Amino acid sequence: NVCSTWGNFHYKTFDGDVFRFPGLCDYNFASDCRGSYKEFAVHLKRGPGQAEAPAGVESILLTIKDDTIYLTRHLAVLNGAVVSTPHYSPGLLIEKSDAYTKVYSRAGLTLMWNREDALMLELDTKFRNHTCGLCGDYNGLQSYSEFLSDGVLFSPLEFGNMQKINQPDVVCEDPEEEVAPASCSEHRAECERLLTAEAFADCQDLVPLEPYLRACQQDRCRCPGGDTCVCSTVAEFSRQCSHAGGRPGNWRTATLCPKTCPGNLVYLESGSPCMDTC
Amino acid sequence: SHLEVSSLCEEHRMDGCFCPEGTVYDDIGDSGCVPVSQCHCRLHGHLYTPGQEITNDCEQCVCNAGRWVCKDLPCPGTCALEGGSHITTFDGKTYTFHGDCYYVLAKGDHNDSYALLGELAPCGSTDKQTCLKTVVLLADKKKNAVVFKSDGSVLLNQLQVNLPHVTASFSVFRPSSYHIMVSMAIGVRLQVQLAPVMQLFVTLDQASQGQVQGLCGNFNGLEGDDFKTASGLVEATGAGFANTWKAQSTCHDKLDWLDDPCSLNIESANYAEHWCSLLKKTETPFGRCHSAVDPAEYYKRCKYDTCNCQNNEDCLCAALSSYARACTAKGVMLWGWREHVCNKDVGSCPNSQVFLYNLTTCQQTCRSLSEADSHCLEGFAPVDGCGCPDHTFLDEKGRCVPLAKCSCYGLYLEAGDVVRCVCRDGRLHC
Amino acid sequence: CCLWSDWINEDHPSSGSDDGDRETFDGVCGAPEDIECRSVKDPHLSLEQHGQKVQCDVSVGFICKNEDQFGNGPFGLCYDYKIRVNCCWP
Amino acid sequence: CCLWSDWINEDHPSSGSDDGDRETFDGVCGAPEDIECRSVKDPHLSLEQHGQKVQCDVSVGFICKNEDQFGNGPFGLCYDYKIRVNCCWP
Amino acid sequence: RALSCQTLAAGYYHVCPDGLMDDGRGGCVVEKECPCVHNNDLYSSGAKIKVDCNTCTCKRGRWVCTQAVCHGTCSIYGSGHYITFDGKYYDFDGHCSYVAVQDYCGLGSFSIITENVPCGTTGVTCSKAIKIFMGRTELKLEDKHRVVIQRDEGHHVAYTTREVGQYLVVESSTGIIVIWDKRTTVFIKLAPSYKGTVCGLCGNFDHRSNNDFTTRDHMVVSSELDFGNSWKEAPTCPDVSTNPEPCSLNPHRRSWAEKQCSILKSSVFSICHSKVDPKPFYEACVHDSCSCDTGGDCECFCSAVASYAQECTKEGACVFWRTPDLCPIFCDYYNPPHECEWHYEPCGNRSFETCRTINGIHSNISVSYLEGCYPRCPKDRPIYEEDLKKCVTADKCGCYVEDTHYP
Amino acid sequence: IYGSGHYITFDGKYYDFDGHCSYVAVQDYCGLGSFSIITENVPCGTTGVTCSKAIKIFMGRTELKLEDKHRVVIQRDEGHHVAYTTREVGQYLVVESSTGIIVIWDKRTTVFIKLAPSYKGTVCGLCGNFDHRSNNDFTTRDHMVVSSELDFGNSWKEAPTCPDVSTNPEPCSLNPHRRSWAEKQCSILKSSVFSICHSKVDPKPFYEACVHDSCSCDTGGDCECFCSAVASYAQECTKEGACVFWRTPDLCPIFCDYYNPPHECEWHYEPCGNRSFETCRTINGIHSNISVSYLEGCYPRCPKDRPIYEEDLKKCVTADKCGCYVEDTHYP
Ligand SMILES: *[C@@H]1O[C@H](CO)[C@@H](O[C@@H]2O[C@H](CO)[C@@H](O)[C@H](O)[C@H]2NC(C)=O)[C@H](O)[C@H]1NC(C)=O
Ligand SMILES: *[C@@H]1O[C@H](CO)[C@@H](O[C@@H]2O[C@H](CO)[C@@H](O)[C@H](O)[C@H]2NC(C)=O)[C@H](O)[C@H]1NC(C)=O
Ligand SMILES: *[C@@H]1O[C@H](CO)[C@@H](O)[C@H](O)[C@H]1NC(C)=O
Ligand SMILES: *[C@@H]1O[C@H](CO)[C@@H](O)[C@H](O)[C@H]1NC(C)=O
Ligand SMILES: [Ca+2]
Ligand SMILES: [Ca+2]
Ligand SMILES: [Ca+2]
Ligand SMILES: [Ca+2]
Ligand SMILES: [Ca+2]
Ligand SMILES: [Ca+2]
Ligand SMILES: [Ca+2]
Ligand SMILES: [Ca+2]
């Protein structure tokens, strides 16, 4: 299945489990904890803190079985050398659109990252009971061994600090427990009206509603003023829509998070990247 | 130099300028067909005359007619337990083990004499991140047990002791608060390091040669039989030899590990490359030792421990302080190698005393001057810690006052007391 | 007559002995007017989008030092660079 | 304190791109006093016993150009050279 | 008090009842019937193993072995790697002729010389010729063949040259044995009568390894480069002042070398991991493959993997590591056109009848661990005549006088 | 397509192109179409030359891919399924199609594409257009005949962001130290070993390819770059009527008794392929449309108690118990 992070520090494991971890240092996103031989490792590095509303990613570190891929915002580095994309070596495809940077590996790994904040990973069914990252394990059980290990229920803030990576020059402080705010239930009407629109018709049976509307609750009351946190969750709902197989419609109006592209390049959701180019 | 060439001469004869019947040609100097008993020797440079003796490592040699005649001198042997797991036996033979038990490091073979144990347990997360934790000494016909925990805390027979502690058969000192020096009358000397990581250095005389067993080998000159177990035959690997020296029967058996840690960790392997390369480049104060120590094997272990342990700077600074340790053992002392690399404790010395590189046992207080022949214990190595300069010996507490008003040690009285012995500079008028 | 030169890639990070990458304009021109500072395997990126710290001016040429790239990425090596120079002829 | 330097062999005839062999003293000293100009694989020969035409002075260093060795032997290549420099320290 | 048959000689410093003790196999065993452990295998009482010339016996949890003195072996292999007769490993990259073994040590009867030339561009050297001086006879091993030079008039110290697998084997009646894989690897063996009476780059063979760095002027030094520079044959040969690093002078060849040479630390050789230490054979293979940068580097590789697999056979673990993609071997080249007799025996262990050993002639060591192609002669002519690589009837083989085959 | 970027078109035009992208080799979507064959050229060395490391075959909606010494089926369509066949003949892998398209691959860098003569003048790509007239094989993607090898080859790249090749490298000039080995090993082709083929195949463009290939395998495994270039010449010699036996245990050895049941000796090295034995396809009428009996490799010589070679397991079987062969899959 799919692990994913997006928005203002929202996460989603291979078995659901949407939570919110505002850690800023350097983490393990998914890894092969089989024990005998590690096939892959994906290391996430949150930035210095962009602002209150967004939450970027500074760099992604990825090691597949012989070689190390280092992704930043502008360039992609394979084994210390800059690559021109697309890159076609016979176990590894690295290609760069105008929106996403994809990495396709024969080991059953697929990474896809727009270069600000949204990062998603896809693994095949070979790695079951072996993954050990912040994306949980890949057993299929909802919240079983991620949060309730030996009877004690781990909070999502102490589940994330366990997944940290120690770098041998820099001391980075873990984020402390904030005082428990009010459960923002005074904006459930706006998230339910917005996300179940007519454009999301043939995905109400594919992806659920309750996790991605729960994540919409904090994005309305932690991000006041401009709407830049609510349209990274419904932008993630229209990516989970168009990954199971469905096709969403256009929801971005001129007043609901518009996007601009030069020329007469109109923006759409669910259209093919294979363009005939004159 | 190359005598007896003509016994392997696959050439016919021609003309040219030659030697007479005897009178071999001078190669080492520059003269002609000199007699054989005027051949000047050579030894890394200098043109030694035929008869000039020299004092080498463990032997003394005299230049005979072209060849050296060497004769053995007594010299000790040193087993080291560095890092968490890097054993160097008495006869060379460095190996890596990664145990989890008490292990017999050296013990006397007769029935009693002594036994030196040591705990090599995992300290980090995995099993391959091991550390030394406890040194146990069983001395004086194995009725006295001395325990060296990894926080100081020397304790004899489950009871804390105060240092120094000088007895008839052994004595334990503490000169620099991260260094413990133990001397025995049998011929065994210990040096326990406490910071950054715990390490151990053992020294035997050459009278005990071929008369010890443990993880330090048998000390007989050959290093092919150091992996010879106590039941016959030589083992192949270090972890197969060392499972025969478990001091507890309920310990599991350990196995080797054919991996390097600098491939399993990509974030630690650039930090290991940048800082352990200072052992090999000559702009640093480590190129002074390159003529004596040959850092190519310290560089390989420096990368090993740095990529492996969880606190990477404590394994860097321990492996850089072991090249500097084994270079002062051959004369070349590195004054001031801690200025760019491991200086997180240099400036933290107290108000009067400074950071030294040649701190020894007999630079102590004026209470040590009261005995002055009882506890000095020559034969150890100098260590680096906080201490006082060339004068102004240490007082009873705090700063080190000069020699005139030091103390008069009975209780250490101040410099105003009259017995008829007026308290004076060091000595007393008694 | 102020034509640009060609691209000069006469040094590499994984070869040479200058511990980095240095490209100079000797054998072509004496005192240039302008210099262009790009990379080999992705030549539309600026020098601020590589993140490595270099100097690239008309006086001496291009200098990248591998010791300056410590702590920047996980690899710590210079990228492969190339330059043009602009010189005017009578 | 006017100790000699080491031997510097930082260039080769069958490698590099300067079409010959050039050895300079940068990274060691600024303004030397003396320079010694010898060969790698037979280091007791003078520069007049090699027969190749070079320049080797204290100002710029050592220069051998493969185009200058045409018509001299049957091979027409520079030999492999190495240098010392003499610099005084206070 | 809980003894364990492995902590007998430890001391019991810090389940089974009193009397009985654990054996590491299962239930509690008396002290008399206690087993033995050797290289991670568990041998019960009265078991027999061999160690290189001797025979041992698990008696009472300890080994009881016979005391005979075995032959001693010097090794020279790859890009300048050595193992002395007393087992000291070092590296020396010299470019001259060097004394390997001789007994003209301060008058003498033999000398073995090695000729080390640069193989690569990084400054490392490997061995390309062997000269054997026995009395006044001079052999020379050069260009995949042996050459006789200067055979003396009537003395003629009896030697024998035959080919065993992929290697060429010279033996002498005086106790000197040279084994050569026709490229760079040499094995010298001496009978145990040469104890403490030799010198050279192979040491002095006195079962004490802290004096193997004795120079030509009888001085024990601590440097690999002061010792090895003193055994050069010509005075005008240069001195080696440092050892090169090939994987640092060729950064682009490191990724291939460390991936091909990782077969040794893998599950293919996992039977030998408890019997031979793979770590100095992994480091030799990477040093050898980063430096064959002028041509033919898959020959530098396959020799380094067969130096490790030879020790594994010699210690009791036959491993079959070659595939048609990794270091292939071509043994059906030698067959009569499609009658299939030459088979690849990966660990040599087959004792067939030659036409020497049918007339009593036997060697003094066991060379039945040498990899190569071996015959399996049919049942109408089951006698292998070695100097023509033909299976013959026991009558019509040859003569073998003065080390020459006469039909 | 062979070695470090060497080509021969359907009309017999030899050229060199060292591109680093995906390139159209053959297609009939030429200005609607039924197939496409793509080559994936990556740098092999440090000098800037490239060699072919993957082949993608598009037939209708089926996509094969030849990668890592094996064939992989990708996107098998629902009910159309253009009938193809994959089998292994000697050292090579051979894909055949019912429509007339044949791809032969030595599992490293050498590819042979064959088309039935119904495709005359109806293809394009880096292999030309197959109209028996070779002064128009350098037609670019926009239907323009150019005279440059580098304007033609740069127009058949698949992605627009792939760079342009602006010069061809010279490997024996960028590696002067590898020239003496390369010109001495590759001189077998002009020697007395191949002297039966010297009057039937011109050795001169195979000598120059072998030296170009051996000066540039400078990162590892150069005795594989060599033995492939000597087997490209000896394959033409068999195809023209001259069987040459050039391999020795010191020069490019081959290991064919690896495949034997432990010491029963059936797999022999046939140096020029010419043997016609019974498989379990051809016992049921199934025959190919070309003659692949010139391909070097190890061939069986099955005994007289089971003389039928079942190919998908490399076993000699009795004529009854071989298999099924439905939808290109062996079922026991
Ligand atoms: C194996 O070693 C024996 C013992 O030295 C060799 O026997 C010697 O042979 C020579 C002539 O061949 C005689 O002069 C010696 O007297 C023999 N020694 C003894 C003790 O009798 C034997 O030759 C060696 N084997 C081979 C094949 O050479
Ligand atoms: C050899 O070529 C013939 C001629 O095209 C192939 O026969 C075709 O087979 C397909 C299905 O297999 C049919 O749809 C066509 O109608 C056949 N053609 C004719 C003219 O009848 C044959 O399949 C090819 N051989 C192989 C092994 O595929
Ligand atoms: C572990 O086994 C399989 C995969 O190995 C998986 O489907 C299953 O759900 C897992 N079970 C448990 C109890 O973790
Ligand atoms: C240590 O060395 C210093 C040299 O700077 C000098 O004070 C003296 O030789 C030593 N100090 C002692 C022995 O207290
Ligand atoms: Ca779970
Ligand atoms: Ca020993
Ligand atoms: Ca460089
Ligand atoms: Ca450059
Ligand atoms: Ca040059
Ligand atoms: Ca030079
Ligand atoms: Ca010895
Ligand atoms: Ca045409």
Side-chain angles (χ1 to χ4, degrees), chain C residues 1-9 11-66 68-86:
Chain C
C1 183
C2 294
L3 57 87
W4 290 96
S5 177
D6 291 331
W7 292 102
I8 299 168
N9 193 6
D11 195 359
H12 295 283
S14 179
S15 294
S17 296
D18 57 355
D19 198 1
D21 194 0
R22 291 179 181 177
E23 293 292 327
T24 187
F25 56 89
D26 291 331
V28 175
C29 183
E33 181 67 27
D34 193 359
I35 190 166
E36 184 177 1
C37 307
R38 295 293 177 89
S39 179
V40 175
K41 292 181 184 292
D42 195 0
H44 73 278
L45 294 173
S46 179
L47 294 177
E48 292 85 4
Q49 294 181 356
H50 287 286
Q52 288 182 350
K53 61 182 291 294
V54 297
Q55 62 183 357
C56 189
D57 57 355
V58 298
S59 178
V60 63
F62 180 75
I63 292 93
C64 186
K65 183 70 176 177
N66 286 320
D68 291 331
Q69 281 74 242
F70 179 74
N72 194 358
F75 297 105
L77 293 174
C78 290
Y79 295 152
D80 194 359
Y81 291 92
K82 64 182 181 180
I83 60 169
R84 289 178 180 175
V85 294
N86 191 0

Side-chain angles (χ1 to χ4, degrees), chain B residues 228-343 346-352:
Chain B
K228 182 179 178 181
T229 58
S231 66
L233 297 173
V234 175
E235 295 289 324
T237 62
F241 168 69
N243 291 318
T244 62
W245 290 104
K246 297 185 288 185
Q248 294 175 356
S249 66
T250 63
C251 296
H252 294 286
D253 290 333
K254 299 295 178 182
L255 189 64
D256 284 331
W257 182 57
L258 296 175
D259 289 329
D260 54 351
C262 293
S263 297
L264 298 174
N265 290 318
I266 191 66
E267 71 275 16
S268 297
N270 194 5
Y271 181 77
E273 178 66 29
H274 180 73
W275 294 103
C276 295
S277 296
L278 300 172
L279 294 173
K280 289 172 70 176
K281 64 179 73 174
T282 61
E283 294 85 4
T284 61
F286 295 106
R288 293 178 64 190
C289 294
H290 290 172
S291 297
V293 187
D294 193 1
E297 67 272 14
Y298 292 93
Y299 176 73
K300 293 181 182 179
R301 290 183 245 138
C302 185
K303 288 176 92 289
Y304 189 83
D305 292 331
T306 303
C307 292
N308 196 2
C309 66
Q310 62 182 357
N311 191 359
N312 297 111
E313 186 178 1
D314 291 332
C315 297
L316 180 65
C317 292
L320 294 175
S321 66
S322 295
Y323 182 75
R325 184 184 183 274
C327 186
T328 62
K330 297 186 291 294
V332 177
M333 186 180 289
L334 294 176
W335 290 349
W337 65 272
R338 293 177 182 268
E339 77 275 17
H340 292 169
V341 292
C342 294
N343 57 4
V346 174
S348 296
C349 292
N351 56 5
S352 67

Side-chain angles (χ1 to χ4, degrees), chain B residues 8-20 22:
Chain B
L8 279 71
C9 184
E10 56 183 359
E11 290 180 352
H12 68 281
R13 64 185 68 188
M14 293 300 292
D15 56 356
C17 291
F18 288 151
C19 288

